[PDB]
C-alpha cells in the first residue's frame, strides 16, 4: 500500500520596427 | 533548376492541387540552406509596392 | 594523399577523398572568393520587379564588411553534385550590414 | 511495481508537459491561427 | 478476445494481450474546439461548444509473426479513401469505428522487435476516430514494406562501403505515421472529417546493439561513410537481408542525435543506444 | 516410454570440456550439482477476461550450480585465461572462458542412464580460496549455459 | 502549528502538518527583473537590478473538515481590494505578509479529497508576496461554493439525462486560481504591486473512479450526452448531492484529454484516471 | 586512463574514471543540416545532405585536485584562436580532435565539489567537434579564477553587510560555458567552422546547505541585503576565503528561483536546496 | 519522499523545464514584450 | 537499480523533450531563420 | 595437468604486504578466508532468437573476506594511516590503505602447493573492537582487490 | 612491531564521558561491544579496461554498537537532555547528546593493552524498557562517532 502511495507576449512596436528594413525593400528594388 | 530563367516554360504536375500543366516562369528564387528553388508561374504581382 | 605526404605504392591515389555531392554556392567579390558564407538567396524576375541577391557570412573585426563598398561587383556561382560552376547571378552591392 | 510507481506518474506529466500547444499574442490579441486541425496522443513506444 | 483493423479486403488481427496488469486500451475523449473565454467580468467564464469532438484510441498488443507486422505497417501507412475500420472487442464501444492514424503524429504505429524474443512483436497504435461518411480525398498510394527470405546481417551501405550491424544485443524499433493527413472539425457531426492526402509519410527504423569485436573498424566504417561524408540527394541503403523477413530500403540519419556511441566504466566494449534512419524517396 | 525412476546423487559423473578441442578439463570431487534449463515466460492477459490468454517463452539459459571439494589448478587457470588460453593471473579482457559440461547418471535400479549436456557454461565468479576452521575447502560455482545440447537415455 | 490566511473578518487556519519528512513550506526568492546583458565585450556580463523582487510561498497542509476547505476555496477565489494576509508560524518570516494567489497560475490552490481518507483534505497553496500598501482595484466579487446536506451520488446531467458517477475508488481534486490578476514590478521597494481584477477565474473539479457494473450503460450515457453532443453555451450540471457538503454547479469538459477510459490486462472493469470539468458562467 | 584537453602550452588531464558501470564518454553524431522535405507527393520524402555534420562528446570524470579544477574552468572559459585540442584514450577516436565548448550552451563544463569527498571533484564536459583549420577570431581573452590560501567560511557581502554560509551540508557546483561563440555549418566538409568571440561567457556558482543555528539572523541577513534590496549596477561580493583554494568574485542572483528556503515536517531547521549566483563584470 | 530516488530527482527538473518560458528575436533584437508581470510556480497537487 | 534505472529511463526523454525547440509558420511557409548555428546537449550535472 | 585434490583449511598461511615496500604487515589467527575473483556478465541476446548470442566480462573485482581472532595493532594502524603511513587516529584524507595479500596452502595429500596472490585489497571498514561476552574477540574483514596477480603450484 | 594476540572480551573496560567536562557518565554491565571505523569507498573504473583504476574514501564515521544489561538512569537522562543538559522527559530540540567513548582491553597473554577512543558518539534511539518474561532486561544501542581519536598500546 506504501508502494501504491508511491504511484508568448509579442511587442507590436518591435516587430513593426525590425521588419521596416524589409517592408520597404520591394519598392527600393523598383526605385521608388 | 539553376539553368532555368524567367520567360522559360516548364511542365508542372501537382496532386492534390489538381494542376497538370505547362507554365511560363515569371520569377525564380533560389535559397541555399533550406535548398529550395521557388518558381512563380504565369505572372507576378506585388503587394504594397504595387 | 597529398603530394609528398606518402611513399610510393603505400596508398591508393585519390584517398581519403570522394566525388562531390550536395549544392554549393560561391560568392565572388571583385574576383576574390568570400570563404565564410553560410547562406545565399538569389532572385531572378520579370521586368516590373528587381533581380537581387542576399548573402550571409560570418565576420571578425569588420574585416569582411570592408570588402563590400556600395557599387562593388558580386557574382554568385552555383554547382550541384560534380557539375561545373555556373555564374547564376551578377550585380553590385547596394547594402552591406553587420549586426550582432 | 517499485519502478512502475515512479514510472507511471512520470509518463503521465511527460504528456502534460510535451503536448502543450503554442498561444502567442500581440497587444492582448491572439495571433495563433485557429486552424481546426486535431492532434492526439503519440504511440507509446 | 482480439481486435481487428481493416480496409476493404485487407485485414489484420491484433491480439490485445499484455503482461500482468499493463494498459491494453486507453480511449480518450475531448473538446479541443470549445471556446472557453480567457477573460470577461464574471467570476467563471462564458463558453461555447459548437463543433465535433475528439476521440482517440491507444491500443497496446503483441503480434505472433513478422508477416502480419509488415501487413499492419503497410495498412497504416497506405493513403486510401477506403475507410480504415477498427473493431474493438469490448462492450463499451460500437462493433465498428472508422479511424485515421493519429491526427498530427509522426508515430501513429510503433513495432518493437526486442532482442531475445522470437515470433513476438510489441505493437502500439494511436488512432483518431473520424466520421464514417466523411472520409475525403482524390489520391491513392498503396504502401509496401520490402521483403526477402535470407538471414544475413543487417547491412548499412553508403559510399560503396557496406557495414554489418552486430547481432549482439540487436533490437529493432520501427515507427510509422501519416502526419500530412488532415483531421478537421465539422459543425454538428459528433466525429471529425478525414482528409486523406497522397503526400509524404513518416517511416523510421531505429536500431540498438553493442559492438563487441573489431570495434574501431566497425564504428569508424559507419561514421566515416555515413556521418562525416555528404550524402547528396541519395542516402544509406539499409538492407535487412531477410532478418524479420525484411528486404532493402533507402534511408538517411536525421537531426541532432540519430547516432550515439556510449562508453561505460569497467566495460571493454561500446554500446549503441540508437542508430536511427528515416526512410527516403525510392518508390519510383 | 521409460518408467520414471529414482536417481542416486553419488552415482553421477560430471565432466568439463574445452569447446575448442572437446578435450577434458580436470575437475573432480563434486558434492552438489544442479542443472536447470529456463526461459522467461510472459504470461499474457486480455481485455475483460480475468483468465490468462497466452504464455510465451523468451530469453533462454541453463542455470548451472556446482559445489565441489577438490581444487583444480587447470579449471581455475582456464577460467582466468579466457577462451583457448590458460593464465596464472587475472586477464583484463572481455571474453569469459566457455566450458562444455556433461553429467551422466544411472537410474537407481538400472532402468536408464540419463546424460545431460550443456553448451558454453560461463561462471561470473570463481572461488579460489574457501577456508573455514576445521573444514576442507568447499567451492561453489554459479553459472549459465546457452542451451541443453543433449538429454537422453544413453544406456545400451 | 497552523498558518493563518485571512481577509478582513474572514479567516482560515491551515494545519501545516504532513506525513514523515515531507515539505510543509517552500519559500522561493528571485529577481525576475534583473537585466543581465546577453552580450558585450567583457568576459562576464554587466547587470542592472532596479525593480521589486519576487517572493513566493508553497504551503502544504491538511484540513480536518470539508466546510473549512470550501471557506478556503472561496477566500482564495474572491476578488477584493481588502488585503489577503498570511501568518506563517516560523521565525524566519515576519508575523504577517500580504499576498496574492500565485501570480499567473490556474492552480494557486489545490484541495484533494482522496478515497478512504474521511475528514482529511490535502491542501496545497501557492502565494506571491505583494506590497501591503499596493493592493489596488475597483470591483469586489465574493466567490461562493454552493453547499447542501444530502448524501447522494455525484451526478452529471446534460441533455435532460443524468449519470451517477461510481462510488468505487472515487477521488475528487478541486483546483482554484486567479490568473487574470496582475502582479507588477515597482522601482523603489522590495515587493510588487497587486492589481485585483473583477474578472474570470479558474475553478476546476477533477474526478477519478473505477466503473465496476452496468459498465457500457454508465460510460456510454456519459460519453454520448456530454462528449458527442454539442453543448452550446450551457453545459453539464455537476451535482455533488451533498458529498463533501457540496451542492450543484454548471461546468464543461475542456481541451484534448478531459476524460479517459482505461482498460488493463486481466481486469473485468474500466478505470477512469481523470474526468475534468471547469466551472462556467452561473452567478447573478 | 586520462583524457587530455589542451590549448598550446596549457594542458589538463581528466582521469575519466567513475563508480561501477556509469557512462564515461558519450559521443553523439548527427546531421542538423539535412533538408528532409516536410511534404510533396511521394510516400517517403526527398532529402538533401550538403553541409558539415555534428559530432559531440560528453565526458564524465573526477579530478583529485582543486587547483587542476580551476585550470580546467579557466581553460574552458578562455577565448583564444589557438585550437582547443582533445585527446581521447579509446581506439575508435583519432589521437587528437579540435573542439569548442558545447556549441550554444550555458553549461559546457560542470564542476561539483560535494559534501564529504575531500580532494574529489566531479567533472562533466560537453564539447563540439570543429574543423582544425577553421578556428577564427579577432583576439584572446585569458579567463582567470581568483585564488587565496585561507580556510575561512564562504562569505556573501551586500549593503556593507557580510553573511557567512553554514559549513553544515555545504556543497558547491560551478558551471561554465561559451554561448556567445558561433559554431557554423560549412559546405562540402566534415566538421563545422568555429568563430571564437571576445564576448560575454556564462560562469555560475551554486551552493546547497542546511542552516542549523542562528537561523532567522542568517536567512534574514541574506534575504534582506541580497533579495529585498535593489543592487543597482554593482553585484554581491562572493568570497570563498580560500575554501577549495578560491578567492573573491563579484556576482548576482538571477531569474525566478535563485534562492529557496525549505521547511520539512518534523525537522527543527531550514534546508537551502540552491543558492545560485552568476559572476558579473569585474575585469580591468 | 520514500520513492524520492526517482521522485525528487524528477519533480525538480519538471519545475525547471516548465519555467523554460518562450523568448524570440528578429535579426538579433528581442521581440518579446517587457511586460513587468510575474509568474510564480503552481500548487504541487 | 529502481532509482538508477528509473533515472536513466527518465533522463533520455528529458533530453528528447529539451531538443524539441521552437519552429513557426505563416500560411504554410517557415518564418524561423535558417541560421546555420549548431546546438549540442549541455553538461550532465 | 595436475590431478585435482582436497585442500585442508588449517594448512593455509595468509600474509599481508605493504605495496610500497613488499614489507610484511603483521597479521595472524585467521579462522575463515574466502578469495573470489569475479566479473559482471553481460548475457547478450539477438533480434530473432530466444538463445544467447554472446556473453562478456566487465567490472573485474576480487572479493576478499577474512574472519580472524588475533588483533594486530600494525594492521589497524596501517589502515588508519592510509598508503605509506601509520596513524593512531582517523585520518581526514581520501586515499585508502591498499594491502597486497598472499595465501599459500598445501594440497591435502601433497600433490601441489597452491599460492593465491591479490593486489591492492582495500577494506571499506575496519573492526577495532568485537567483544562478545564469554568469547574471544572475532573480527570480520570484507574488502575488494584489483586483480589476482598469481595462482600457481609453487611446490618444487 | 607488536606480535598479534588474542583478546578476551570479558577483560574489556568500556567508559563514557561528557565532552563538555571530560566527566564520566555512569555505564556498566556490558555484554557486547563492536567498534568499526568506516568510510564510503568510491570504487572507480576507466573506459578501456575491465580492471579497477582507483579507489577513494569519502564520508567517514565510526559505527558503535553496544549490548548491555545494567540500566543507567544517568546515561538515559543525559540522552534525553541533549548536549550539556539532563532531562526526565523527551526534549523537542535538534541537538543529540554526544558521548566520548573509550574502551580498554588487555591482550590475552599480556603482549599489549589496546585502547580504543571515539569522539562524539550519538545514538538515534535509546531502549528504555526491554522486558522479556523470564529474562533480565537487555539493551542494544546502535550509534555513530565522528572519528577514532586513539588506537594505541597503552601498556607500560
UniProtKB/TrEMBL annotation, chain A:
Residues 1-32 are annotated as: Disordered. Residues 20-32 have a biased composition (Basic and acidic residues). It comes from the Viruses. This is Phate tail tape measure protein. It comes from Haloferax tailed virus 1. The chain holds residues 294 to 341 of 341 of the full protein.
TrEMBL record, chain B:
The chain holds residues 303 to 352 of 954 of the full protein. It comes from the Viruses. It comes from Haloferax tailed virus 1. This is Baseplate hub. Transmembrane segments: none annotated.
From TrEMBL, chains E, G, H:
This is Uncharacterized protein. It comes from Haloferax tailed virus 1.
Automatic annotation (TrEMBL), chains F, K, L:
This is Tail tube protein. It comes from Haloferax tailed virus 1 (HFTV1).
Amino acid at each position: 500500500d506504501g508502494g501504491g502511495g508511491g504511484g508568448a507576449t509579442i511587442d507590436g512596436r518591435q516587430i513593426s520596427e525590425s521588419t521596416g528594413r524589409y517592408r520597404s525593400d520591394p519598392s527600393r528594388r523598383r526605385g521608388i | 533548376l539553376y539553368d532555368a530563367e524567367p520567360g522559360d516554360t516548364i511542365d508542372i504536375t501537382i496532386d492534390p492541387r489538381g494542376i497538370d500543366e505547362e507554365f511560363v516562369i515569371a520569377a525564380i528564387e533560389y535559397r541555399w540552406g533550406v535548398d529550395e528553388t521557388i518558381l512563380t508561374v504565369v505572372e507576378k504581382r506585388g503587394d504594397v509596392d504595387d | 594523399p597529398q603530394l609528398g605526404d606518402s611513399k610510393l605504392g603505400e596508398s591508393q591515389l585519390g584517398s581519403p577523398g570522394t566525388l562531390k555531392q550536395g549544392v554549393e554556392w560561391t560568392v565572388v567579390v571583385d574576383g576574390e572568393e568570400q570563404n565564410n558564407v553560410w547562406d545565399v538567396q538569389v532572385v531572378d524576375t520579370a521586368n516590373p520587379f528587381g533581380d537581387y541577391a542576399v548573402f550571409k557570412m560570418d565576420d571578425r573585426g569588420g574585416q569582411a564588411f570592408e570588402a563590400y563598398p556600395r557599387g562593388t561587383r558580386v557574382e554568385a556561382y552555383v554547382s550541384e553534385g560534380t557539375e561545373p560552376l555556373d555564374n547564376r547571378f551578377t550585380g553590385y552591392v547596394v547594402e552591406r550590414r553587420e549586426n550582432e | 511495481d517499485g519502478g512502475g510507481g515512479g514510472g507511471n506518474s512520470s509518463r503521465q506529466p511527460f504528456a502534460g508537459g510535451f503536448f502543450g500547444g503554442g498561444n502567442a499574442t500581440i497587444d492582448g490579441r491572439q495571433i495563433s491561427e485557429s486552424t481546426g486541425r486535431y492532434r492526439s496522443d503519440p504511440s507509446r513506444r | 478476445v482480439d481486435a481487428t483493423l481493416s480496409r476493404g479486403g485487407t485485414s489484420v488481427d491484433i491480439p490485445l494481450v499484455e503482461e500482468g496488469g499493463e494498459i491494453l486500451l486507453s480511449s480518450t475523449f475531448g473538446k479541443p474546439e470549445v471556446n472557453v473565454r480567457k477573460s470577461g467580468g464574471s467570476l467563471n467564464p462564458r463558453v461555447i461548444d459548437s463543433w465535433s469532438g475528439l476521440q482517440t484510441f491507444q491500443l497496446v498488443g503483441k503480434l505472433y509473426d513478422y508477416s502480419t507486422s509488415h501487413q499492419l505497417a503497410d495498412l497504416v501507412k497506405t493513403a486510401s479513401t477506403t475507410p480504415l475500420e477498427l473493431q474493438i472487442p469490448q462492450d463499451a464501444y460500437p462493433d465498428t469505428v472508422t479511424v485515421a492514424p493519429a491526427a498530427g503524429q509522426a508515430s501513429a504505429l510503433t513495432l518493437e522487435y526486442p532482442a531475445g524474443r522470437k515470433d513476438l512483436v510489441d505493437v502500439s497504435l494511436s488512432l483518431t476516430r473520424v466520421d464514417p461518411n466523411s472520409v475525403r480525398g482524390v489520391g491513392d498510394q498503396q504502401a509496401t514494406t520490402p521483403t526477402t527470405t535470407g538471414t544475413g546481417p543487417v547491412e548499412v551501405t553508403a559510399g560503396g562501403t557496406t557495414v554489418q550491424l552486430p547481432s549482439s544485443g540487436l533490437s529493432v524499433e520501427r515507427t510509422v505515421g501519416r502526419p500530412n493527413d488532415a483531421v478537421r472539425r465539422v459543425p454538428r457531426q459528433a466525429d471529425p472529417r478525414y482528409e486523406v492526402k497522397a503526400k509524404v509519410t513518416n517511416d523510421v527504423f531505429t536500431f540498438s546493439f553493442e559492438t563487441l569485436d573489431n570495434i574501431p573498424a566497425t564504428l569508424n566504417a559507419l561514421t566515416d561513410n555515413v556521418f562525416r561524408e555528404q550524402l547528396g540527394r541519395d542516402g544509406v541503403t539499409l538492407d535487412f537481408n531477410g532478418l524479420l523477413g525484411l528486404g532493402s530500403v533507402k534511408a538517411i540519419p536525421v537531426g541532432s542525435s540519430p547516432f550515439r556511441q556510449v562508453h561505460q566504466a569497467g566495460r571493454g566494449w561500446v554500446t549503441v543506444p540508437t542508430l536511427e534512419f528515416r526512410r527516403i524517396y525510392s518508390n519510383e | 516410454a521409460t518408467s520414471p525412476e529414482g536417481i542416486w546423487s553419488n552415482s553421477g559423473a560430471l565432466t568439463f570440456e574445452d569447446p575448442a578441442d572437446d578435450s577434458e578439463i580436470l575437475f573432480a570431487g563434486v558434492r552438489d550439482v544442479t542443472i536447470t534449463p529456463a526461459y522467461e515466460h510472459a504470461e499474457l492477459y486480455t481485455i475483460d477476461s480475468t483468465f490468462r490468454d497466452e504464455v510465451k517463452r523468451y530469453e533462454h539459459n541453463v542455470n548451472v550450480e556446482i559445489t565441489y571439494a577438490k581444487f583444480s589448478l587447470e579449471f581455475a587457470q582456464e577460467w582466468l585465461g579466457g577462451p583457448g588460453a590458460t593464465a596464472t593471473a587475472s586477464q583484463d579482457d572481455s571474453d569469459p572462458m566457455k566450458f562444455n559440461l556433461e553429467n551422466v547418471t544411472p537410474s537407481a535400479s538400472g532402468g536408464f542412464e540419463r546424460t545431460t549436456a550443456v553448451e558454453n557454461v560461463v561462471f561470473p565468479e570463481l572461488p579460489l580460496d574457501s577456508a573455514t576452521y576445521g573444514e576442507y575447502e568447499e567451492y561453489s560455482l554459479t553459472g549459465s549455459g546457452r542451451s541443453v545440447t543433449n538429454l537422453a537415455d544413453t544406456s545400451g
